[PDB]
Design an enzyme around this catalytic site. Structure first.
Site, PDB file in Angstrom:
ATOM      1  N   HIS E 202       0.807  -1.220   0.000  1.00 18.25           N
ATOM      2  CA  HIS E 202       0.000   0.000   0.000  1.00 18.25           C
ATOM      3  C   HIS E 202       0.844   1.276   0.000  1.00 18.25           C
ATOM      4  N   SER E 206       1.397  -0.862  -6.524  1.00 17.00           N
ATOM      5  CA  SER E 206       1.851  -1.837  -7.491  1.00 17.00           C
ATOM      6  C   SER E 206       2.827  -1.212  -8.470  1.00 17.00           C
ATOM      7  N   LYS E 228     -12.252  -6.655 -13.448  1.00 19.52           N
ATOM      8  CA  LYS E 228     -11.154  -7.385 -14.064  1.00 19.52           C
ATOM      9  C   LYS E 228     -10.703  -8.583 -13.199  1.00 19.52           C
ATOM     10  N   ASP E 229     -10.685  -8.425 -11.872  1.00 20.89           N
ATOM     11  CA  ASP E 229     -10.385  -9.548 -10.973  1.00 20.89           C
ATOM     12  C   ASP E 229     -11.421 -10.651 -11.140  1.00 20.89           C
ATOM     13  N   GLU E 272       4.726 -34.895  -3.171  1.00 15.73           N
ATOM     14  CA  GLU E 272       3.750 -34.026  -3.820  1.00 15.73           C
ATOM     15  C   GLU E 272       4.427 -33.205  -4.924  1.00 15.73           C
TER      16      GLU E 272
HETATM   17  C1  HEM Z   1      -0.793 -16.119   0.283  1.00 18.68           C
HETATM   18  C2  HEM Z   1       0.143 -15.387  -0.474  1.00 18.68           C
HETATM   19  C3  HEM Z   1       0.077 -14.092  -1.023  1.00 18.68           C
HETATM   20  C4  HEM Z   1      -0.921 -13.176  -1.150  1.00 18.68           C
HETATM   21  C5  HEM Z   1      -2.398 -13.235  -0.708  1.00 18.68           C
HETATM   22  C6  HEM Z   1      -0.397 -12.083  -1.937  1.00 18.68           C
HETATM   23  C7  HEM Z   1      -1.143 -10.998  -2.403  1.00 18.68           C
HETATM   24  C8  HEM Z   1      -0.665  -9.939  -3.173  1.00 18.68           C
HETATM   25  C9  HEM Z   1      -1.479  -8.897  -3.758  1.00 18.68           C
HETATM   26  C10 HEM Z   1      -2.995  -8.673  -3.567  1.00 18.68           C
HETATM   27  C11 HEM Z   1      -0.673  -8.169  -4.555  1.00 18.68           C
HETATM   28  C12 HEM Z   1      -1.124  -7.110  -5.547  1.00 18.68           C
HETATM   29  C13 HEM Z   1      -1.616  -7.647  -6.888  1.00 18.68           C
HETATM   30  C14 HEM Z   1      -0.563  -8.464  -7.621  1.00 18.68           C
HETATM   31  O1  HEM Z   1       0.511  -7.896  -7.944  1.00 18.68           O
HETATM   32  O2  HEM Z   1      -0.827  -9.661  -7.900  1.00 18.68           O
HETATM   33  C15 HEM Z   1       0.674  -8.629  -4.327  1.00 18.68           C
HETATM   34  C16 HEM Z   1       1.828  -8.052  -4.851  1.00 18.68           C
HETATM   35  C17 HEM Z   1       3.117  -8.563  -4.706  1.00 18.68           C
HETATM   36  N1  HEM Z   1       3.447  -9.726  -4.043  1.00 18.68           N
HETATM   37 FE1  HEM Z   1       2.217 -11.003  -3.163  1.00 18.68          FE
HETATM   38  N2  HEM Z   1       0.943 -12.294  -2.192  1.00 18.68           N
HETATM   39  C18 HEM Z   1       1.236 -13.548  -1.691  1.00 18.68           C
HETATM   40  C19 HEM Z   1       2.483 -14.164  -1.752  1.00 18.68           C
HETATM   41  C20 HEM Z   1       3.640 -13.600  -2.286  1.00 18.68           C
HETATM   42  C21 HEM Z   1       4.896 -14.292  -2.468  1.00 18.68           C
HETATM   43  C22 HEM Z   1       5.094 -15.773  -2.134  1.00 18.68           C
HETATM   44  C23 HEM Z   1       5.768 -13.399  -3.007  1.00 18.68           C
HETATM   45  C24 HEM Z   1       7.143 -13.565  -3.345  1.00 18.68           C
HETATM   46  C25 HEM Z   1       8.076 -14.474  -2.748  1.00 18.68           C
HETATM   47  C26 HEM Z   1       5.032 -12.172  -3.214  1.00 18.68           C
HETATM   48  C27 HEM Z   1       5.532 -11.030  -3.837  1.00 18.68           C
HETATM   49  C28 HEM Z   1       4.804  -9.898  -4.205  1.00 18.68           C
HETATM   50  C29 HEM Z   1       5.356  -8.744  -4.859  1.00 18.68           C
HETATM   51  C30 HEM Z   1       6.852  -8.495  -5.073  1.00 18.68           C
HETATM   52  C31 HEM Z   1       4.317  -7.949  -5.217  1.00 18.68           C
HETATM   53  C32 HEM Z   1       4.370  -6.636  -6.020  1.00 18.68           C
HETATM   54  C33 HEM Z   1       4.258  -6.924  -7.503  1.00 18.68           C
HETATM   55  C34 HEM Z   1       4.295  -5.668  -8.341  1.00 18.68           C
HETATM   56  O3  HEM Z   1       3.525  -4.729  -8.067  1.00 18.68           O
HETATM   57  O4  HEM Z   1       5.074  -5.623  -9.302  1.00 18.68           O
HETATM   58  N3  HEM Z   1       3.726 -12.327  -2.814  1.00 18.68           N
HETATM   59  N4  HEM Z   1       0.647  -9.776  -3.574  1.00 18.68           N
HETATM   60  C1  LIG Z   2      -2.318  -2.128  -4.894  1.00 20.72           C
HETATM   61  O1  LIG Z   2      -2.663  -3.463  -5.195  1.00 20.72           O
HETATM   62  C2  LIG Z   2      -3.774  -4.225  -5.007  1.00 20.72           C
HETATM   63  C3  LIG Z   2      -4.505  -4.238  -3.717  1.00 20.72           C
HETATM   64  O2  LIG Z   2      -4.154  -3.574  -2.744  1.00 20.72           O
HETATM   65  C4  LIG Z   2      -5.696  -5.068  -3.616  1.00 20.72           C
HETATM   66  C5  LIG Z   2      -6.393  -5.021  -2.266  1.00 20.72           C
HETATM   67  C6  LIG Z   2      -6.118  -5.823  -4.674  1.00 20.72           C
HETATM   68  C7  LIG Z   2      -7.382  -6.764  -4.636  1.00 20.72           C
HETATM   69  C8  LIG Z   2      -7.107  -8.060  -3.835  1.00 20.72           C
HETATM   70  C9  LIG Z   2      -7.429  -8.286  -2.562  1.00 20.72           C
HETATM   71  C10 LIG Z   2      -8.139  -7.212  -1.708  1.00 20.72           C
HETATM   72  C11 LIG Z   2      -7.143  -9.590  -1.704  1.00 20.72           C
HETATM   73  C12 LIG Z   2      -7.667  -9.504  -0.284  1.00 20.72           C
HETATM   74  C13 LIG Z   2      -7.876 -10.652   0.597  1.00 20.72           C
HETATM   75  C14 LIG Z   2      -7.272 -10.926   1.847  1.00 20.72           C
HETATM   76  C15 LIG Z   2      -6.233 -10.011   2.511  1.00 20.72           C
HETATM   77  C16 LIG Z   2      -7.604 -12.186   2.733  1.00 20.72           C
HETATM   78  C17 LIG Z   2      -6.923 -12.560   4.088  1.00 20.72           C
HETATM   79  C18 LIG Z   2      -7.221 -13.968   4.510  1.00 20.72           C
HETATM   80  C19 LIG Z   2      -8.215 -14.650   5.203  1.00 20.72           C
HETATM   81  C20 LIG Z   2      -8.073 -16.159   5.431  1.00 20.72           C
HETATM   82  C21 LIG Z   2      -9.497 -14.012   5.790  1.00 20.72           C
HETATM   83  C22 LIG Z   2      -9.962 -14.429   7.173  1.00 20.72           C
HETATM   84  C23 LIG Z   2     -10.976 -15.478   7.143  1.00 20.72           C
HETATM   85  C24 LIG Z   2     -11.553 -16.307   8.076  1.00 20.72           C
HETATM   86  C25 LIG Z   2     -11.234 -16.335   9.575  1.00 20.72           C
HETATM   87  C26 LIG Z   2     -12.625 -17.322   7.709  1.00 20.72           C
HETATM   88  C27 LIG Z   2     -14.026 -17.064   8.189  1.00 20.72           C
HETATM   89  C28 LIG Z   2     -14.607 -18.297   8.672  1.00 20.72           C
HETATM   90  C29 LIG Z   2     -15.913 -18.696   8.780  1.00 20.72           C
HETATM   91  C30 LIG Z   2     -17.097 -17.803   8.369  1.00 20.72           C
HETATM   92  C31 LIG Z   2     -16.377 -20.062   9.325  1.00 20.72           C
HETATM   93  C32 LIG Z   2     -17.872 -20.302   9.128  1.00 20.72           C
HETATM   94  C33 LIG Z   2     -18.380 -21.578   9.641  1.00 20.72           C
HETATM   95  C34 LIG Z   2     -19.159 -21.913  10.749  1.00 20.72           C
HETATM   96  C35 LIG Z   2     -19.603 -23.325  11.114  1.00 20.72           C
HETATM   97  C36 LIG Z   2     -19.692 -20.922  11.767  1.00 20.72           C
HETATM   98  C37 LIG Z   2      -5.381  -5.794  -5.897  1.00 20.72           C
HETATM   99  O3  LIG Z   2      -5.776  -6.463  -6.816  1.00 20.72           O
HETATM  100  C38 LIG Z   2      -4.212  -4.973  -6.036  1.00 20.72           C
HETATM  101  O4  LIG Z   2      -3.611  -5.016  -7.263  1.00 20.72           O
HETATM  102  C39 LIG Z   2      -4.247  -5.066  -8.532  1.00 20.72           C
HETATM  103  C1  LIG Z   3       6.137 -28.535  12.735  1.00 19.04           C
HETATM  104  C2  LIG Z   3       6.632 -28.423  11.302  1.00 19.04           C
HETATM  105  C3  LIG Z   3       7.719 -29.079  10.820  1.00 19.04           C
HETATM  106  C4  LIG Z   3       8.600 -30.023  11.614  1.00 19.04           C
HETATM  107  C5  LIG Z   3       8.236 -29.012   9.457  1.00 19.04           C
HETATM  108  C6  LIG Z   3       8.139 -27.959   8.612  1.00 19.04           C
HETATM  109  C7  LIG Z   3       9.205 -27.535   7.689  1.00 19.04           C
HETATM  110  C8  LIG Z   3       9.710 -28.228   6.637  1.00 19.04           C
HETATM  111  C9  LIG Z   3       9.717 -27.761   5.186  1.00 19.04           C
HETATM  112  O1  LIG Z   3       9.654 -26.467   4.664  1.00 19.04           O
HETATM  113  C10 LIG Z   3       8.970 -25.571   5.437  1.00 19.04           C
HETATM  114  C11 LIG Z   3       9.754 -28.958   4.194  1.00 19.04           C
HETATM  115  C12 LIG Z   3       8.315 -29.260   3.786  1.00 19.04           C
HETATM  116  C13 LIG Z   3      10.720 -28.731   2.914  1.00 19.04           C
HETATM  117  O2  LIG Z   3      11.121 -27.440   2.745  1.00 19.04           O
HETATM  118  C14 LIG Z   3      12.467 -27.371   2.535  1.00 19.04           C
HETATM  119  C15 LIG Z   3      10.003 -29.262   1.654  1.00 19.04           C
HETATM  120  C16 LIG Z   3      10.553 -28.677   0.349  1.00 19.04           C
HETATM  121  C17 LIG Z   3      10.092 -30.796   1.682  1.00 19.04           C
HETATM  122  C18 LIG Z   3      10.654 -31.443   0.482  1.00 19.04           C
HETATM  123  C19 LIG Z   3      10.654 -32.944   0.585  1.00 19.04           C
HETATM  124  O3  LIG Z   3       9.398 -33.507   0.598  1.00 19.04           O
HETATM  125  C20 LIG Z   3       9.221 -34.860   0.663  1.00 19.04           C
HETATM  126  C21 LIG Z   3       7.932 -35.401   0.683  1.00 19.04           C
HETATM  127  O4  LIG Z   3       6.859 -34.593   0.665  1.00 19.04           O
HETATM  128  C22 LIG Z   3       7.764 -36.806   0.730  1.00 19.04           C
HETATM  129  O5  LIG Z   3       6.463 -37.325   0.757  1.00 19.04           O
HETATM  130  C23 LIG Z   3       6.323 -38.663   0.417  1.00 19.04           C
HETATM  131  C24 LIG Z   3       8.878 -37.692   0.754  1.00 19.04           C
HETATM  132  C25 LIG Z   3      10.167 -37.196   0.724  1.00 19.04           C
HETATM  133  O6  LIG Z   3      11.250 -38.058   0.752  1.00 19.04           O
HETATM  134  C26 LIG Z   3      11.206 -39.068  -0.187  1.00 19.04           C
HETATM  135  C27 LIG Z   3      10.409 -35.748   0.701  1.00 19.04           C
HETATM  136  C28 LIG Z   3      11.768 -35.136   0.677  1.00 19.04           C
HETATM  137  O7  LIG Z   3      12.805 -35.816   0.716  1.00 19.04           O
HETATM  138  C29 LIG Z   3      11.800 -33.682   0.612  1.00 19.04           C
HETATM  139  C30 LIG Z   3      13.167 -33.016   0.593  1.00 19.04           C
END
Ligand code: HEM
Ligand SMILES: COc1c(O)c(C)c(C/C=C(\C)CC/C=C(\C)CC/C=C(/C)CC/C=C(\C)CC/C=C(\C)CCC=C(C)C)c(O)c1OC
Ligand SMILES: C/C=C(C)/C=C/C=C/C(OC)[C@@H](C)[C@H](OC)[C@@H](C)CCc1oc2c(O)c(OC)cc(OC)c2c(=O)c1C
Ligand code: HEM
Lengths: 125, 430, 55, 62, 385
Positions: E202, E206, E228-229, E272
Site C-alpha cells: 500500500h 503496485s 477485471k479480478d 507431492e
Molecule cells: C498467500 C500469499 C500471497 C498473497 C495473498 C499475496 C497478495 C498480493 C497482492 C494482492 C498483490 C497485488 C496484486 C498483484 O501484484 O498480484 C501482491 C503483490 C506482490 N506480491 Fe504477493 N501475495 C502472496 C504471496 C507472495 C509471495 C510468495 C511473493 C514472493 C516471494 C510475493 C511477492 C509480491 C510482490 C513483489 C508484489 C508486487 C508486484 C508488483 O507490483 O510488481 N507475494 N501480492
Molecule cells: C495495490 O494493489 C492491489 C490491492 O491492494 C488489492 C487489495 C487488490 C485486490 C485483492 C485483494 C483485496 C485480496 C484480499 C484478501 C485478503 C487479505 C484475505 C486474508 C485472509 C483470510 C483467510 C481471511 C480471514 C478469514 C476467516 C477467519 C474465515 C471465516 C470463517 C468462517 C465464516 C467459518 C464459518 C463456519 C461456521 C460453522 C460458523 C489488488 O488487486 C491490487 O492489485 C491489482
Molecule cells: C512442525 C513443522 C515441521 C517439523 C516441518 C516444517 C518444515 C519443513 C519444510 O519447509 C517448510 C519442508 C516441507 C521442505 O522445505 C524445505 C520441503 C521442500 C520438503 C521437500 C521434501 O518432501 C518430501 C515429501 O513430501 C515426501 O512425501 C512422500 C517424501 C520425501 O522423501 C522421499 C520428501 C523429501 O525428501 C523432501 C526433501
C-alpha cells in the site's frame, strides 16, 4: 550499478576503435530488439526513478523536457494497455533517442560521492 | 599580546596594543550571583544610573564614552577615551565612585531610571524568547542557589527597590578587596599605574564582602508554554565546567563539534557536522547553537534551538542527544580536529576584536577569578593537546546517563516529558 | 548505597550480566526450595518410608 | 508571581550529601526486576517446551 | 466527506479496495494476488468444516477422512476442494512469484514486500506438509518421517529436536495429533503475514509492465480492477471445478489411499508435485548435511535478487538477454521437478546436479553479469563520444 560506472566502461569501449567497431553494432541491434522506441519512449525515460539520485536529477530537468517526458510516459502506458504499438511514424528515431537525463544524473552522483568522501576523510599529523 | 597585572594598594591589570582608543574601568568581583531573591536587579539598576543622561552628559562634554556590563560572577563600569586622555577617564571614574556616588542617587534621577529598567526588563520578558529561555535555564538548573538569579533582575524585586538597597549593596561589594582596575587600548601599564598611585586615599579598605553558600546543579525543567508564539524555543544542558577546570577546554571543544546552525544560510547547511544529515531531511529546526558556559562555581554544557516544526520537536531532541551519546563512545579523530581549528578561530575572534571594551571585560573577569590571564597562544597549546581519549573521558563523566535541565517557551506541546529526554542521555548495550 | 558503585559504578546492570545471573539464580533457588520443602515434610516422603521397608 | 522564582520542592528533594543514592537504588531495583523476569521467562518457556516431550505413558521398554 | 472515507473501518476498505490508485497499464499477471487471497479463503473454510468430522488419533485419522468421503453430506466435495485447492494455491503462488521475478517487483522500494512474500511461501509449504500428514496414508507417514528428519542434520542437538518433534521414538499418535493442531494454527499466521504483505504494498503501490513510474496515470481499483479480478476468479473456479468433479485424484498419489505402515516404505514413494524441484535439489547432493543445507538455500537465495540485479531499469520487458535467461530459469525449474519424479538412475542424477547448478547460478552469476552487460549495451548504443 552507478551511471558513473556504466559511463567509465562505455567510454573506454567507445574510444578504442578495436572494441568500438566490434560492440556498437551489437549494442545498436540490442536497442532495436528492446522495442521501447515503438512505444514512443527514449531510453532515459526507462530509468528506475525511486531513489535520491534520480529524484535530484528529475528535479533539475528544464521544464520543457519535463513536460515532454510526462507525455511520453503517459502515451506509453495507454499504448501498452491497448496491446498495440504506435504508428511507425510516431516511433522515437535514433537521432531523438538522446541521453537527456544522463548529465544531470552524473552530476548528482559526483556531488553525492564527494559528500561521502568528505564525511569520511581521515587526517594525518 | 601582553598581560601586566600588579597590585599597589588596589590591583591594576592592563593589556596594551597600538590600536586607536583606550578603555579604562573598574571591574568588581560580585554580580547577580551575589544578590538575593528580593534585591535581585540592584546591580542592573546601578549600571543604569551610571549611564543616566545626567552622568552621561558630563562624560560627553569631556569627550568620554560610557559602558557597563552586569554578569553573574562580576560587574564592570567602563569609560573609553581617546588615548591621550587616559588621565581624564580616571578623573571621571573617581568623580563618580567617590564624589558623585552620593549625587547620582537623587530622587528625580532614580525614579526616571527605575521607570526605564522596568520598561526594559518587561520588554525582555515579552519579546526576547531565546535569551528569556536561556535565563530560565539558569533559573531552574541552579534553583535556590546564587547562579539562579537573572542578571537583569525580576520585575517584582525591581519595582520594590529603593535608594537604600543600591546603597547597602554598594557598601558591601564596591569594596577594594572586591575590585580590579582594568585598562585596555594602547596605554602602557606604567602609564596608568602611576596615575593611580598618584592619588592615595583607600576608601573602605580592610572591609570584606559577605560569604554565602555554594552553587549546585539540580536536574529539572521549567516549561513556559505559550501557544500564541509562532515558534518553540528550547534550551537543554548538563552541569558543565567552572572556569579553572582542567576540562575547561575539553568542554568548549565538545561544544564546537556540534557547533551552531542556521537553516537559511547556505554555508551553514554544509558544515562538517553529522547531526545535520538528520535534521535537514524534514527541517527539524530553524537554528541551534551549542555552548559551554563557565562561571566561578559551575557551568552549563548544552544547546539551544528554535523551530517552527512543532510536530517533530521530539525528533529534534532525539537526534541531537544521540549525537551527544557519540562523544562517550565513537567520536572520530577528524571531528576533534575540525573542532580544534574552529575553536581557535572563534576564541581568536573573541580575545582580539578591534574593540577594547570587550578586551576589558574579558581581562577583568579572568583576573578576578584566577589572578591572571592565560594568553591566547597558551590556550592554543592546551587546545591542540586534546585527544579523542580526553573528550571521551569528559563526556563519560558529564554527558552519559546524567541529569539534564530543560527550559522552553512557545509551542512546546510536542516537547516530550522529562524522563523521555533524560533516557536519551545514553544507549542500550549488551 | 556504595555496594552498587563497586560492581556496576553508577551504570545500570547490562543484559548479559542479567541473563548470566538468571542462569545462576535458577539452580541455586531450586536447590534452596527443594531442600526446605523436603525437610519441612520429613517423615511423610517416600525417601523416609523406604528407610523402613526392606524386601 | 515571577517565573524565575521556582516553587518549593524541599519535601521531595533528597538533601544531597550522597549524590548517587536514588540512582543506585533505582538501578538495583531495575536490575533485580530484570533478573527475576528472565529467570521467569526461561522457566515458562521450558514448561511449555517440555510438554511436547514423550509422555509418561509412551515410554515403553519393549 | 463520503462515509466510506470518514468511518474508521470503511476507510480501510476504501483505501485498499475502492479508491486505491492503480497504474492504468497493469496486465492480467497482476490478478494472481487476489487469486491467492481467494485460495487462502477456500482452504480455511473447507478445512474448518472438515475439522468438524476429523479425528486426529493415529488409529482413527485415515478412517475419519474416509468417513468424510463416504458419510458426510457433500464431504467428498469439501475434501476434494481442499486437496486440489492446495495444489492450485501453489500453481498460482509460483505464477505470482514468477511475475515478480520477471517485472523486477522485488526491487527497491519493494524489497520489504518481497521479503515478506518469501516468508509466506515458507509458511505455506510448511502448512501443506502438516495437512498432508493428517490423512495418515502411506505418503503421510513417510513424508512426516523424512521431513522431521531434516532436522537431524543439525550438529549435536539434531536427534533431540527430532524426538521432541515426534513426541517419542518414531512418528506416532503424539506426532499426528500435534501436526493437526499445528495445521489448524499456521493458516491464521499466514493470514496475518498477508496483511503485513498488503501493508507494504500500500505504501508504494503496485508496479507495472513498463517498469517505470505509475504516478502520471492512475485509475481507481473500484470498478476497473474489481471487475477485471472477477474475470480470472471465474476462470480459476471453472478449472478448479473440472478437477474437483471430473478428475479429483489426478494431482495426488495413489499410495495415500493406503493406511500408513511404520514397517514398510513403498517403492513408489514420490513427493507431492509442488515439492519436487526442491526434492530434486536435495537428492543431487550425495551428503546428508549438505543436501538439506543446499535445499533450504534454494529458497533463501530468493532474498539475494535485489542486490544481484545490477540493472538500472526495473523489469525484463525491454531486455533481450534477461528475457531469454528468465525462461531458461523457468524451464530449468520444470526440469528439476521432472527429475524429482524420476528414479535415482544414470542420466537423471547428473542432469539434476547440472540443473541444480543452473538454479543457483541464475541468481548469483547470470543476473549480475547479464544485467551489467545490458547496462553497458544501452549506453554505447546511443552515446556518440
Ligand atoms: C498467500 C500469499 C500471497 C498473497 C495473498 C499475496 C497478495 C498480493 C497482492 C494482492 C498483490 C497485488 C496484486 C498483484 O501484484 O498480484 C501482491 C503483490 C506482490 N506480491 Fe504477493 N501475495 C502472496 C504471496 C507472495 C509471495 C510468495 C511473493 C514472493 C516471494 C510475493 C511477492 C509480491 C510482490 C513483489 C508484489 C508486487 C508486484 C508488483 O507490483 O510488481 N507475494 N501480492
Ligand atoms: C495495490 O494493489 C492491489 C490491492 O491492494 C488489492 C487489495 C487488490 C485486490 C485483492 C485483494 C483485496 C485480496 C484480499 C484478501 C485478503 C487479505 C484475505 C486474508 C485472509 C483470510 C483467510 C481471511 C480471514 C478469514 C476467516 C477467519 C474465515 C471465516 C470463517 C468462517 C465464516 C467459518 C464459518 C463456519 C461456521 C460453522 C460458523 C489488488 O488487486 C491490487 O492489485 C491489482
Ligand atoms: C512442525 C513443522 C515441521 C517439523 C516441518 C516444517 C518444515 C519443513 C519444510 O519447509 C517448510 C519442508 C516441507 C521442505 O522445505 C524445505 C520441503 C521442500 C520438503 C521437500 C521434501 O518432501 C518430501 C515429501 O513430501 C515426501 O512425501 C512422500 C517424501 C520425501 O522423501 C522421499 C520428501 C523429501 O525428501 C523432501 C526433501
Ligand atoms: C493455507 C491453508 C491450508 C492449506 C495449504 C492446506 C493444505 C492441506 C493439505 C495439502 C491437506 C491434505 C489434502 C489431502 O487430503 O490430500 C490438508 C488436509 C486437511 N486440512 Fe488443510 N490446509 C490449509 C488450511 C486448513 C485449515 C485452517 C484447516 C482447519 C482445521 C484445515 C484442516 C484440514 C483437515 C481437517 C485435513 C484432513 C482432510 C483432508 O485430507 O483433506 N486445513 N490441508
Amino acid at each position: 550499478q552507478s551511471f558513473t560506472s556504466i559511463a567509465r566502461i562505455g567510454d573506454y569501449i567507445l574510444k578504442s576503435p578495436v572494441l568500438s567497431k566490434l560492440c556498437v553494432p551489437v549494442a545498436n541491434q540490442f536497442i532495436n530488439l528492446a522495442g521501447y522506441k515503438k512505444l514512443g519512449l527514449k531510453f532515459d525515460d526507462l530509468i528506475a526513478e525511486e531513489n535520491p539520485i534520480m529524484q535530484t536529477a528529475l528535479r533539475r530537468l528544464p521544464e520543457d523536457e519535463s513536460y515532454a517526458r510526462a507525455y511520453r510516459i503517459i502515451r506509453a502506458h495507454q499504448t501498452e494497455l491497448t496491446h498495440h504499438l504506435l504508428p511507425r511514424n510516431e516511433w522515437i528515431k535514433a537521432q531523438e533517442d538522446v541521453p537527456y537525463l544522463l548529465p544531470y544524473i552524473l552530476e548528482a552522483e559526483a556531488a553525492a560521492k564527494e559528500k561521502d568522501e568528505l564525511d569520511n576523510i581521515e587526517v594525518s599529523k | 599580546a601582553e598581560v601586566t597585572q600588579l597590585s599597589n594598594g588596589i590591583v591594576v591589570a592592563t593589556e596594551h596594543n597600538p590600536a586607536h582608543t583606550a578603555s579604562v574601568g573598574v571591574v568588581f568581583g560580585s554580580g547577580a550571583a551575589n544578590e538575593n531573591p528580593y534585591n535581585n536587579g540592584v546591580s542592573n539598576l546601578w549600571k543604569n544610573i551610571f549611564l543616566s543622561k545626567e552622568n552621561s552628559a558630563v562624560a560627553a562634554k569631556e569627550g568620554l564614552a560610557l559602558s557597563s556590563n552586569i554578569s553573574r560572577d562580576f560587574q564592570s563600569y567602563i569609560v573609553s577615551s581617546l588615548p591621550g586622555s587616559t588621565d581624564k577617564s580616571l578623573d571621571f571614574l573617581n568623580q563618580s565612585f567617590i564624589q558623585q556616588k552620593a549625587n547620582l542617587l537623587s530622587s528625580s534621577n532614580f525614579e526616571a531610571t527605575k521607570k526605564s529598567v522596568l520598561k526594559q526588563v518587561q520588554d525582555f520578558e515579552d519579546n526576547d524568547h531565546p535569551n528569556r529561555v536561556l535565563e530560565h535555564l539558569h533559573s531552574t538548573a541552579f534553583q535556590n542557589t546564587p547562579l539562579s538569579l537573572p542578571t537583569r533582575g525580576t520585575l517584582e524585586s525591581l519595582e520594590n527597590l529603593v535608594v537604600a538597597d543600591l546603597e547597602s549593596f554598594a557598601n558591601n561589594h564596591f569594596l577594594n578587596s572586591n575590585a580590579v582596575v582594568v585598562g585596555t587600548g594602547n596605554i602602557k601599564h606604567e602609564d596608568l599605574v602611576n596615575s593611580i598611585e598618584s592619588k592615595n586615599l583607600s576608601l573602605q579598605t580592610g572591609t570584606k564582602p559577605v560569604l554565602k553558600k555554594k552553587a549546585a546543579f539540580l536536574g529539572s525543567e521549567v516549561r513556559l508554554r505559550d501557544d500564541t508564539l509562532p515558534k518553540a524555543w528550547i534550551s537543554l544542558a548538563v552541569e558543565g565546567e567552572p572556569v579553572n577546570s582542567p576540562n575547561y577546554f575539553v568542554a568548549k571543544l565538545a561544544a564546537q563539534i556540534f557547533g551552531s546552525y542556521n537553516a537559511f544560510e547556505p554555508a551553514s547547511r554544509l558544515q562538517g557536522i553529522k547531526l545535520l544529515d538528520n535534521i535537514q531531511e524534514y527541517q527539524l529546526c530553524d537554528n541551534f547553537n551549542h555552548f559551554s558556559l563557565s562561571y566561578k562555581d559551575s557551568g552549563l554544557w548544552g544547546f539551544s534551538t528554535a523551530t517552527r516544526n512543532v510536530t517533530m520537536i521530539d525528533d529534534l531532541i532525539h537526534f541531537t542527544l544521540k549525537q551527544w551519546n557519540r562523544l562517550t563512545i565513537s567520536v572520530t579523530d577528524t571531528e576533534v580536529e575540525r573542532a580544534k581549528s574552529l575553536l581557535k578561530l572563534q576564541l581568536g575572534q573573541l580575545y582580539e576584536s578591534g574593540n577594547p571594551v570587550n578586551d576589558a571585560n574579558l581581562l577583568g573577569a579572568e583576573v578576578l577569578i584566577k589572578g591572571s590571564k592565560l594568553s591566547l597562544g597558551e590556550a592554543f597549546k592546551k587546545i591542540d593537546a586534546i585527544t579523542v581519549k580526553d573528550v571521551k573521558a569528559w563526556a563519560g563523566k558529564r554527558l552519559w546517563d546524567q541529569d539534564i535541565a530543560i527550559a522552553g517557551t512557545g509551542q512546546i506541546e510536542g516537547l516530550l516529558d522529562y524522563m523521555r529526554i533524560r533516557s536519551d542521555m545514553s544507549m542500550m548495550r549488551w | 548505597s556504595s555496594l552498587y558503585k563497586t560492581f556496576f559504578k553508577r551504570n545500570a546492570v547490562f543484559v548479559g550480566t542479567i541473563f548470566a545471573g538468571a542462569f545462576v539464580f535458577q539452580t541455586v533457588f531450586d536447590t534452596a526450595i527443594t531442600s526446605w520443602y523436603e525437610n519441612h515434610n520429613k517423615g511423610k516422603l517416600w525417601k523416609d518410608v523406604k528407610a523402613r521397608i526392606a524386601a | 508571581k515571577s517565573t524565575y522564582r521556582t516553587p518549593n520542592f524541599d519535601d521531595v528533594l533528597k538533601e544531597n550529601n550522597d549524590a548517587d543514592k536514588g540512582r543506585s537504588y533505582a538501578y538495583f531495583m531495575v536490575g533485580a526486576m530484570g533478573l527475576l523476569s528472565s529467570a521467569g521467562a526461561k522457566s515458562t518457556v521450558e514448561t511449555f517446551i517440555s510438554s511436547m516431550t514423550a509422555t509418561a505413558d509412551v515410554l515403553a521398554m519393549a | 466527506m463520503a462515509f466510506r472515507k470518514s468511518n474508521v473501518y470503511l476507510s480501510l476498505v476504501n483505501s485498499y479496495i475502492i479508491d486505491s490508485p492503480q497504474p492504468s497499464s497493469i496486465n492480467y499477471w497482476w490478478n494472481m494476488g487476489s487469486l491467492l487471497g481467494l485460495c487462502l479463503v477456500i482452504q480455511i473454510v473447507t478445512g474448518i468444516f472438515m475439522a468438524m468430522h476429523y479425528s486426529s488419533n493415529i488409529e482413527l485419522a485415515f478412517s475419519s477422512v474416509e468417513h468424510i468421503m463416504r458419510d458426510v453430506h457433500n464431504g467428498y466435495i469439501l475434501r476434494y476442494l481442499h486437496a486440489n485447492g492446495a495444489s492450485f494455491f501453489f500453481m498460482v503462488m509460483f505464477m505470482h512469484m514468477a511475475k515478480g521475478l520477471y517485472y523486477g517487483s522485488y526491487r527497491s522500494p519493494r524489497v520489504t514486500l518481497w521479503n515478506v512474500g518469501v516468508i509466506i511461501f515458507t509458511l505455506t509449504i510448511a502448512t501443506a506438509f502438516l495437512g498432508y500428514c493428517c490423512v495418515y496414508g502411506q505418503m503421510s507417514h513417510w513424508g512426516a518421517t523424512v521431513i522431521t528428519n531434516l532436522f537431524s542434520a543439525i550438529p549435536f542437538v539434531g536427534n533431540d529436536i527430532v524426538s521432541w518433534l515426534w513426541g517419542g521414538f518414531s512418528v506416532s499418535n503424539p506426532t499426528i495429533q500435534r501436526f493437526f493442531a499445528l495445521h489448524y494454527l499456521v493458516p491464521f499466521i499466514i493470514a496475518a503475514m498477508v496483511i503485513m504483505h498488503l501493508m507494504a504494498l500500500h505504501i508504494h503501490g503496485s508496479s507495472n509492465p513498463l517498469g517505470i513510474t505509475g504516478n502520471l496515470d492512475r485509475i481507481p481499483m473500484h470498478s476497473y480492477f474489481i471487475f477485471k479480478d472477477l474475470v480470472t476468479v471465474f476462470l480459476f473456479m471453472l478449472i478448479l471445478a473440472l478437477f474437483v468433479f471430473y478428475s479429483p485424484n489426478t494431482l495426488g498419489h495413489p499410495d495415500n489411499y493406503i493406511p500408513g505402515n511404520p514397517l514398510v516404505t513403498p517403492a513408489s514413494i514420490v513427493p507431492e508435485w509442488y515439492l519436487l524441484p526442491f526434492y530434486a535439489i536435495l537428492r543431487s547432493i550425495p551428503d546428508k548435511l549438505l543436501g538439506v543445507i543446499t535445499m533450504f538455500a534454494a529458497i533463501l537465495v530468493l532474498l539475494v535478487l535485489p542486490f544481484t540485479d545490477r540493472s538500472v531499469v526495473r523489469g525484463n520487458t525491454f531486455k533481450v538477454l534477461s528475457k531469454f535467461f528468465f525462461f531458461i530459469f523457468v524451464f530449468n525449474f520444470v526440469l528439476l521437478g521432472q527429475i524429482g519424479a524420476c528414479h535415482v538412475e544414470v542420466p537423471y542424477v547428473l542432469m539434476g546436479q547440472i540443473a541444480t547448478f543452473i538454479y543457483f547460478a541464475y541468481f548469483l552469476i547470470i543476473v549480475p553479469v547479464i544485467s551489467t552487460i545490458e547496462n553497458v549495451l544501452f549506453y554505447i548504443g546511443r552515446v556518440n563520444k
